[PDB]
């Protein structure tokens, strides 16, 4: 198979990194590179990275001065030479057939992107939560319009579980210094695609154990773009109202007063002054 | 007539302030207060303010530590006790019948807001440009939907030439530390109104002699709000695409590289990947 680039930002994850890398080296799909971007870790993460690189030549390390998750992923994208690009968080781990299933689903269907689901692992209790069962398995091709019309966490705000043609990344980078960076970026990759293939399997495990401002501005930017391109807004509008409610209260609790002012005003307009 | 609050931010306008204030004290509509917000001027502006306060008791001065145009206007809004609120830039000046015409247009039509046009004065050549002639005069009542469907400078991004019921300002303030603050605020006041009256007279004179980021996020925010409230997006979408073009090139010229990738990417999507 053609080369897949796995981009893995690493920042102070010494407890979890070995589990992650072991689950990647066990992939049944062999032709990958793993790009570990150590974002200036101050625990043993950087050492663990070096140790794994010494026993598998598919692992490439980039050490860099701490600059945040966006900067780490953008470095991953710049360094990747694969035909495909996928993201794995160093907190998490995957089934041994993860990559292969994503690959087949993309190539056999002629899609530009393939997406699977995830299950969770509760670290506090050391137990899986299998929300996605075999009985609920399905696979499906989508147009972009069908894809954009929906969880919203899996789809828009979570960068892993997805396999991207590398050419999609022309002009697309994660926004610097900001959290909710996936939220701002992943959907722009969808808008580049012609067809997206989804597989409802939980092959990625999300280990389980805020940036209000970005939450709001990401939603506004996404709505403006979709509108300018002629996509339907119904769901994005509901999402936006929901985020405004959360912001209006949480900004106040955090003492983010100008943000509070803004969000309340916006929520006041939508609810009490709609068009007549 | 009921009290009109005229909010006038003052920052280092010693050359122009006397002209502005003289044109205001000559108003045929007498029942106003002028709130001068000296935003920590370092020329003779603050002294000129004090001199005028001594000969007309309708003038109230607020001195404050320099905090920007938004902070100055927000201070004006907080201190205003009028039933109506209007803005005058200290750079500019008005006809003697300016306030009266705005007042009548609002009250006689039962509107929540009245708006007039402006002409310009070229300071370098000391000459008027009468774009708005008497032969092109008209007056008209508008719904918000009719109003929102258009210059765009006069309407959305320019805070003077408009008379607002004071009640409209519940929850509405100019955004701190940002330029294009008018761009972000004025239209939110329109959305509070039931009916807007426009008078096509150039009774305000704009004296004639950048914030790329805000330009873009203001447009995205406005589109998201309007969409959420059910208004039409056609013109805003055209406005947005135009600002992206300007941003894509100007951000690059200024060395604003992350902003440049963002705007190019957005413009690339809109023009080369519209919905299929």
Numbering used by the authors:
A (entry chain A), B (entry chain B): 4 to 153, 160 to 218, 229 to 295
What do the authors say?
Glycosylation catalyzed by a series of glycosyltransferases is crucial for biogenesis of SRRP adhesins in Gram-positive bacteria. dGT1 is a unique bifunctional protein involved in the biosynthesis of an SRRP adhesin Fap1 of S. parasanguinis. It is essential for glycosylation of Fap1 by two distinct glycosyltransferase activities derived from the N-terminal and C-terminal regions, respectively. In this study we demonstrate that the C terminus of dGT1 (CgT) is an independent glycosyltransferase, transferring GlcNAc to the Glc-Glc-GlcNAc-modified Fap1. Thus we conclude that CgT catalyzes the fourth step of Fap1 following the action of Gtf1/Gtf2, Gtf3, and DUF1792.
